[PDB]
Amino acid sequence: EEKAKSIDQATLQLLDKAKQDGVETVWDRKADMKVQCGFGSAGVCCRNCSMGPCRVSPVPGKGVERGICGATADVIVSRNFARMVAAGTAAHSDHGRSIALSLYHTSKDGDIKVKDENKLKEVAKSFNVETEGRDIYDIAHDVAKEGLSNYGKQLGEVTLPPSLPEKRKELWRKLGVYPRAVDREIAAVMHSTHIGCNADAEAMIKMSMRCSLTDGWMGSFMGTEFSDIMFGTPHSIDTEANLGVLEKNSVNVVLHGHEPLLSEMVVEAASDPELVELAKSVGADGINLCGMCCTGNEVSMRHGIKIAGNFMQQELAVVTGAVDGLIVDVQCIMPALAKLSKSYHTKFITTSPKAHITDSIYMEFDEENPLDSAKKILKEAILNFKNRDQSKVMIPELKCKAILGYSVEEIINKLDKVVNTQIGPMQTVKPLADVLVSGVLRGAAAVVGCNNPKVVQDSAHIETIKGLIKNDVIVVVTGCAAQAAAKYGLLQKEAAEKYAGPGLATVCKLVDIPPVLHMGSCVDISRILDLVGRVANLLGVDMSDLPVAGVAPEWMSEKAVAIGTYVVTSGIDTWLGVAPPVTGGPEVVDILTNKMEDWVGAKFFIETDPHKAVEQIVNRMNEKRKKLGI
Amino acid sequence: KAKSIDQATLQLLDKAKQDGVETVWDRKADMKVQCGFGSAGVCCRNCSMGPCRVSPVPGKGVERGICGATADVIVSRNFARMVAAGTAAHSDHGRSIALSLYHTSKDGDIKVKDENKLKEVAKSFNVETEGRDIYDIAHDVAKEGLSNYGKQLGEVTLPPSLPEKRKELWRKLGVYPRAVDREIAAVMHSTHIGCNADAEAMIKMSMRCSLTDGWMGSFMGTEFSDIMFGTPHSIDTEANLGVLEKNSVNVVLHGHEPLLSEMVVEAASDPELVELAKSVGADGINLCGMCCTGNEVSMRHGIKIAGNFMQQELAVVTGAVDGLIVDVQCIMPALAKLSKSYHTKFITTSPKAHITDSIYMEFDEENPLDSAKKILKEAILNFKNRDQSKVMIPELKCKAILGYSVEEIINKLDKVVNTQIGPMQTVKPLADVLVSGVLRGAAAVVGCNNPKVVQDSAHIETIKGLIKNDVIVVVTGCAAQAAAKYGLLQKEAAEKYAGPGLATVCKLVDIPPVLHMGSCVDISRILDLVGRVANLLGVDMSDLPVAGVAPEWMSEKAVAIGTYVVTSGIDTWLGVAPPVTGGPEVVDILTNKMEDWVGAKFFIETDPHKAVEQIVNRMNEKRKKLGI
Numbered sequence A: 001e002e003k004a005k006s007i008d009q010a011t012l013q014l015l016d017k018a019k020q021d022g023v024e025t026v027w028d029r030k031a032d033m034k035v036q037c038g039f040g041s042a043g044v045c046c047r048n049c050s051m052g053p054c055r056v057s058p059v060p061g062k063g064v065e066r067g068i069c070g071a072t073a074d075v076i077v078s079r080n081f082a083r084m085v086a087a088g089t090a091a092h093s094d095h096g097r098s099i100a101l102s103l104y105h106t107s108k109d110g111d112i113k114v115k116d117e118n119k120l121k122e123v124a125k126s127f128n129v130e131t132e133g134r135d136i137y138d139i140a141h142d143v144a145k146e147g148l149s150n151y152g153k154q155l156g157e158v159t160l161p162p163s164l165p166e167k168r169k170e171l172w173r174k175l176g177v178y179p180r181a182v183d184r185e186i187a188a189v190m191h192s193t194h195i196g197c198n199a200d201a202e203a204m205i206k207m208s209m210r211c212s213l214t215d216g217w218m219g220s221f222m223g224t225e226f227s228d229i230m231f232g233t234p235h236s237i238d239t240e241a242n243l244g245v246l247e248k249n250s251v252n253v254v255l256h257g258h259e260p261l262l263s264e265m266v267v268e269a270a271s272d273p274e275l276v277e278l279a280k281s282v283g284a285d286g287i288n289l290c291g292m293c294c295t296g297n298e299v300s301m302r303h304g305i306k307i308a309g310n311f312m313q314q315e316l317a318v319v320t321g322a323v324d325g326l327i328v329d330v331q332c333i334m335p336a337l338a339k340l341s342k343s344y345h346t347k348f349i350t351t352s353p354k355a356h357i358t359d360s361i362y363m364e365f366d367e368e369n370p371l372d373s374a375k376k377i378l379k380e381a382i383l384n385f386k387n388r389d390q391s392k393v394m395i396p397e398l399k400c401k402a403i404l405g406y407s408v409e410e411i412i413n414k415l416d417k418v419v420n421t422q423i424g425p426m427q428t429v430k431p432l433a434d435v436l437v438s439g440v441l442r443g444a445a446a447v448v449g450c451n452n453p454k455v456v457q458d459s460a461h462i463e464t465i466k467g468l469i470k471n472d473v474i475v476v477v478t479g480c481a482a483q484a485a486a487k488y489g490l491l492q493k494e495a496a497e498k499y500a501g502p503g504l505a506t507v508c509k510l511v512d513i514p515p516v517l518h519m520g521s522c523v524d525i526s527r528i529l530d531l532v533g534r535v536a537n538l539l540g541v542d543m544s545d546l547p548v549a550g551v552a553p554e555w556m557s558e559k560a561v562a563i564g565t566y567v568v569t570s571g572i573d574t575w576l577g578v579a580p581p582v583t584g585g586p587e588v589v590d591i592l593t594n595k596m597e598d599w600v601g602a603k604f605f606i607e608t609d610p611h612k613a614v615e616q617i618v619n620r621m622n623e624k625r626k627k628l629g630i
Numbered sequence B: 001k002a003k004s005i006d007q008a009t010l011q012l013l014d015k016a017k018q019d020g021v022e023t024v025w026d027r028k029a030d031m032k033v034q035c036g037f038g039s040a041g042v043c044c045r046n047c048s049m050g051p052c053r054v055s056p057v058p059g060k061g062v063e064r065g066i067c068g069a070t071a072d073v074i075v076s077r078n079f080a081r082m083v084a085a086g087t088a089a090h091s092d093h094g095r096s097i098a099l100s101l102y103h104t105s106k107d108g109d110i111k112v113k114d115e116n117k118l119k120e121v122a123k124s125f126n127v128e129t130e131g132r133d134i135y136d137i138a139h140d141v142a143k144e145g146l147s148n149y150g151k152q153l154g155e156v157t158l159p160p161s162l163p164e165k166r167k168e169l170w171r172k173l174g175v176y177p178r179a180v181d182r183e184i185a186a187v188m189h190s191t192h193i194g195c196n197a198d199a200e201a202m203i204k205m206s207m208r209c210s211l212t213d214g215w216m217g218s219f220m221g222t223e224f225s226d227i228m229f230g231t232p233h234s235i236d237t238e239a240n241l242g243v244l245e246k247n248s249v250n251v252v253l254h255g256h257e258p259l260l261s262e263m264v265v266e267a268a269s270d271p272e273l274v275e276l277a278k279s280v281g282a283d284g285i286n287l288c289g290m291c292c293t294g295n296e297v298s299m300r301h302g303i304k305i306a307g308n309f310m311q312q313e314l315a316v317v318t319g320a321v322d323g324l325i326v327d328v329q330c331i332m333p334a335l336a337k338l339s340k341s342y343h344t345k346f347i348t349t350s351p352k353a354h355i356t357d358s359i360y361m362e363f364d365e366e367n368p369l370d371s372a373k374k375i376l377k378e379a380i381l382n383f384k385n386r387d388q389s390k391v392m393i394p395e396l397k398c399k400a401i402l403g404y405s406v407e408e409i410i411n412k413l414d415k416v417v418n419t420q421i422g423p424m425q426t427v428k429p430l431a432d433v434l435v436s437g438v439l440r441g442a443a444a445v446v447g448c449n450n451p452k453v454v455q456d457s458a459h460i461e462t463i464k465g466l467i468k469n470d471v472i473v474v475v476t477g478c479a480a481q482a483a484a485k486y487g488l489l490q491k492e493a494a495e496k497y498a499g500p501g502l503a504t505v506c507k508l509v510d511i512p513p514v515l516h517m518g519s520c521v522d523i524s525r526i527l528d529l530v531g532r533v534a535n536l537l538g539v540d541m542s543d544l545p546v547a548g549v550a551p552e553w554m555s556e557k558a559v560a561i562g563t564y565v566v567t568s569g570i571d572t573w574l575g576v577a578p579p580v581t582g583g584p585e586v587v588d589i590l591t592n593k594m595e596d597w598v599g600a601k602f603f604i605e606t607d608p609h610k611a612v613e614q615i616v617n618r619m620n621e622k623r624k625k626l627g628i
C-alpha cells in the first residue's frame, strides 16, 4: 500500500480483474517470495560444485570469508556476474544464429526472400563477399555462411561492422578483450568459472567483457542486419500501444517472444484469403494481430503491428479474456502463462524446441515450410474464437498512438531535412553531430531493458526518459523500455513541446521527429552502437569521448547484464536501475563502478532513484563535453 | 568423522594444524549447515527478479518462482548448467590440444609421435593419408577436429567404436549431438528466464550437450594427445606424498593440460637446468604430478604421482615444494594464501585461470619448451629459499602400474589368444570372459574427492567390493590416484583382493585387477573400450554388464561425465547426491524414466557397500536379459 504495482491505468484495471478472477500474477509471486536471500542478493552464494553450497560474508573482515575450495567473496561474486553475461550472450547468440540460418535458406520463389538488396550488398562488403555480376541469393548464402562462421570459427579473426571505431578495436586488443567466435567466448567463461580455475576478479570481469562483445557487435548486430535484409529496413511508421488494442469483435492473436521469422510468417498468414474467410465463418470481423515484448517490437517496427504490452503485462493480456491464441517462441515468456491460461479459453501455444513449457500446446514451427507452419498455428487460434465467452471479456478502453521504425537509415533520412544542399553532403549523421557539438543537444542516451517487480512497473522508465529529454538529451529506446514510452505517449511528435527542453524541442520541430526514438528490439540495441559509432568516426574520436549514456531502469534478465557489459566495454557509461548482485564483492564493485573507466573509458553507475540517475547522466555528459572541448 | 583413510594425509593434516594453516577440511567445517534450498536444487538465481527459492516438499510452502517456475523447472535448469559448465571445461581442454596438433611440425617443439594412430584417426575424419606428408595429415585432422567445436552446418564426426544402435537411438530421442560450443550455448540459452520450463525437455538438452564432451571434446583430447605425446603402454611409477625428496628440487605439476607438463618433463632433462639444480645445492630435479596433469605425464613417462584432489594443500604443508606449477581446473585458490606460509612459489601459467597473489608466468604455446624452461628455472632457483627445519615428508609411498590405453589392454589380451581359433589385436578375449561369466562385469570408478565423504574411503571400498565380486575395474582421475596410493594398481593386488574369476584372468593376462586408464578426458578410452566390446558382440552398450561409479565426485565436469555415461547406455552410481531432491520429476527422470530413453539410469548411493551390492545385482539382471 505504500507503493503501487504500476503507473499504467489499463494494467491496474486488469490487476483488479485478475484478483476477482482468482488468478495469480508475477506481483503476487513476488510478494509470496517475501524477503529475498541476502547472500544471493549480494552475490556471495556459490553453487559451482557439489562441495557447496557455499556462502561467504558480504561484510569483509567478518563471518565466513572463503568458500570450501578457498574462493573469496570477490571470486564468488565475479564468477556469478560472468555466468549472467555468458547466459545473456547465449540467448542473443541463438537468436542471431537462427536468423543467419534463415538467410542461408532464402530463395527467389521460397517463403523467405531478400527484401533489401542494397543492404545485403553493403553488408556483403563487410564480410568480403563479392556482389558484382552475381545472383542476389548466391550473395545472400555467402553472407549467411560468413555470418555463421562468426559463431564458431576456431582459426582466424571475427568480422566486425565498419561503424566500430579503429580506436575502440585497438583498445580492446591491448586490454585483451578483443572478441573471438560467439559460442567459443561463451564456453571460455563457463570453463573459467568452473571450480579451481579463475580466482581473480579483474581477469574474470575482463573475460565477461570480451564475451559480451560477441553479443553487441556480432550476434545481436548480425541478427538486426540479417533481419533487415530478409524483412525490410524499418522506416517511420504509426501504430497503437497498450492492452486497449485488443478488439472484442475480432480474433485476437498475440505474438510473444523474440524470434522474427515466426511473427513475420504469422503476419503474412493473417492476409491469406482462406484464413481471412475462416475468421468471418467463426463469427469475427477479421483477424487482429498484436505483439508483446521483442517480437512485438520487431513486427511493429516493420509493419505497424499494434503492441499489446511489455514484459510484466503478458499475464494481464490473458486476463482480458479476449486472447484467442497466445503464440510464443523463446525468451522472457513467463512459464506461469501455461497455468494462467487454464482459467480462460486462450490457447497458449509453444512453437520452439528450445522452449518447451509443461501443459502448453506444442505446435512446432517448421522453419523449412515457414508460411504453411504459421498458417497451421494461426488457424488453431482463429478456430479458438468460437470458445470465447464474451460475457467475461474485459478490454480496458486505453491505448496510445506511437511512432517508431527509427533505424539508423531512417534517422539519417530525417536529418537530411536540415541539410544545406550546397555547404554539406546528404545521407550522413553530420546534422546530429552538429547539434551535439554546438550544445543544442547536450547528449544522446539509450533507455533499454525489462520490467522488474522491485520497481513500480514502467515508473522508472518514464521518469528517466522524461528527465533526460527535459535536459536536452535526445533519447533512443528499445525493448520493454520503448513499449513503456509507447504506452505512455512519449513516442509522438507532440511530446517534444510537451516534455523536452529548449534545444531538443527545437531540433524536433526542425527535423519532424518525437524527442524519443524507438529503434526496435533488444538485438536492435546494435543499431544504437552503430549510430554512436558513426558519430564517433565522423568527429574522429572514440565512443567513450562522446556525451552519450545507456540506462536500464527496470532490468531483470541475464540478456540485460550482457547488454550493460557490452555498452560499457564499447565506451558508453551505463546506469542500472536495479542493482546487479555484486555488493558482497568490494573489488568487483570497484572494478565495475570505477577501475572500468581506466580500462574502456566508461563504467557502470547503480542508481535506483530515476531522478538522481538523470542528475548523474547530465553531470557525466557535461564532464565529457568539457574534456572534448564542446 | 575421520578426515581421510590415508596415513600420509593424516600425518600432514597434523603438521597443518601445528603450522597454523587452514585446509579444505577446516573451511568445510566453517561452512556449517549448508543451504537446504541450494542443496535440494530449489534455489534459482537466473535473473534479477530473484533470488527465488521454492519448497523442496511438494504441496507445502512457496511452490513457484516469481516468473512462475516450478521446483522441477528450477532443479532441471540448475542441473543442466552444471552439465554445460562441465562440458565447457572439457571443451576448452580438447580445443587447446587440437590447436596444438594444428601447430605441429617436423623440427618444432610439438611433433607427431604416433603416425599410425594419426593415420587411423584421420580415417575417422575422412581425411586422406595415402601419399601425404605426416604434418599435412596432422593439420587436416586438427582442422576437422576443430570444426567439431563450432561447425554451424553439416554433421559432427563421432568415433567408430560408438555402436550404430546407440546413434540411432539418440536420433529418434532428439539428443544426437551438434557442435560442442553450439550445444553449450543451447543449454545456457534454454535455462535463461522465460525459455524452457519442462523437466524432460531440459534433461534431454543436458544429455545432448554431455555427448559433445564424452564422444567429441574428451575423445579428441585423448586421441590427439596420444598422437603428439605417444599412446600409453604399461609403465611403473610411485604414488603418494612420500615421492617428494628432501634433498632434491621438488617441482609439482598440478592442473589438467598435457602440453605444459610434457614440456616441463622435457625441460627437466636439459643439461643446463640439471647443472643449475646441483649448483643451488640439490641432488637433482624431482618432478611430481597431482590430479589430471599428473595422471597424463605418469601414464606416458612414469612421472611420480604426489597426490589427488584433496591432497594438493598437504603437498605444500610438507614444506618441500619449491615450485607448484599449475594451468587450469581443480586448482583450489586457497593455494595462493597457503603458499605464503612456506617458501613455495605458486605459479599460474594460464590466462584462463588467473589467481590473485600467485606468480603469473604465462605459458607461451608458440615457444613451448623455452617457456617451460623459464618456469622450471624459477622453481629450481627457489630451492635456495628452502627451510629444511620446516620440512616433513611422510615416509609413505606405493608402487603402482598404469598406462592402460585401449591399445595396451588389447596387446595384453593377445597373450590369451589361440593362434588358430581367432585373430589377434581385438577385444575378443575380454568379451569371452564376460560372456562366460569368469568376469561378472566391468566397472569404471572415476571422479573427485569431496569433504562430505572421508577422503578416499568410498573409492577404495567400492573398488575392493567390485574386484572381490569378479567385476574387473578400470580407473581414471582422482579415483585412479586413490587406488595408486592404496596399492590396488599392482599385480599382487589380484591374490589379496580379487575374486576367483578375476584372479585367474589377472594371472593369465598378467595385469593388476584395477586398470589405470588415465585422466578424466581419458574416460573417453572407457567409452571406446565398452563400445568395441558392444560391437564385437553385436549389441548396444546398454545390453552389457557394465557400470560407472563416481564415489566422491564434486565438480561440474563429474556431472557432465555421469550424464554422457548414462546417455551412452552405462548405468552410473553417484556417491555424492547431486542437487535434485527438491524436484520430484527430475529425480524420477534421472533414476527411473531415463532407463526407458537410453537403457541406463542414475543410482544415488552414499554407502559404498550398498552400491557394490546394487551394481552386482544390476549386472546379473542385464546378464540374464542378454542370456549370459
Ligand code: SF4
Pocket (backbone or CB within 6 Å): A046, A047, A048, A049, A050, A051, A052, A053, A054, A066, A067, A068, A069, A070, A071, A076, A194, A195, A196
Ligand atoms: S566452487 Fe568453491 S565456493 Fe563454489 S560451491 Fe564449490 S567449494 Fe564452494
Ligand code: SF4
Pocket (backbone or CB within 6 Å): A037, A038, A039, A040, A041, A045, A046, A047, A053, A055, B035, B036, B037, B038, B039, B043, B044, B051, B053
Ligand atoms: S542456495 Fe544460496 S542464494 Fe540460494 S537461498 Fe540458499 S544461500 Fe541463499
Ligand code: SF4
Pocket (backbone or CB within 6 Å): B044, B045, B046, B047, B048, B049, B050, B051, B052, B065, B066, B067, B068, B069, B074, B192, B193, B194
Ligand atoms: S528465473 Fe524465475 S525462478 Fe529464476 S530467479 Fe528469475 S524469477 Fe526467479
